[PDB]
Design a protein around this ligand. Structure first.
Ligand SMILES: [Mn+2]
Ligand SMILES: [Mn+2]
Ligand SMILES: [Mn+2]
Ligand SMILES: [Mn+2]
Ligand SMILES: [Mn+2]
Length: 90
């Protein structure tokens, strides 16, 4: 994993949000979290081959902090529909 992505993961807040891994400007995986810190730190010790792949292929990580868990649910669904990222199921 790129050093700048590891750093961004370790700085993420204990707040609800949506995250987007990208390569060459294109989203490759979109997810949501009750706490961005907890969900993103799981990428450092991969429990599945898919989590390993996403973290090695990415050249960028964007995070979006939201108002609450209701907003996280709808924003994540809308962005998956818009971008159809390679690692999200269809
Ligand atoms: Mn690494
Ligand atoms: Mn999801
Ligand atoms: Mn497995
Ligand atoms: Mn980055
Ligand atoms: Mn960007």
């Amino acid at each position: 994993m790129k050093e700048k992505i590891r750093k961004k993961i370790l700085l993420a807040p204990e707040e609800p949000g949506v995250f987007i891994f990208k390569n060459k400007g294109v989203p490759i995986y979109i997810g949501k979290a009750k706490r961005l810190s907890n969900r993103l730190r799981s990428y450092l010790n991969p429990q599945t081959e898919k989590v390993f792949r996403i973290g090695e292929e990415a050249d960028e990580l964007e995070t979006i902090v939201v108002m609450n868990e209701r907003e996280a649910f709808i924003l994540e669904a809308n962005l998956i529909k818009k971008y159809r990222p390679k690692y999200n199921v269809r």
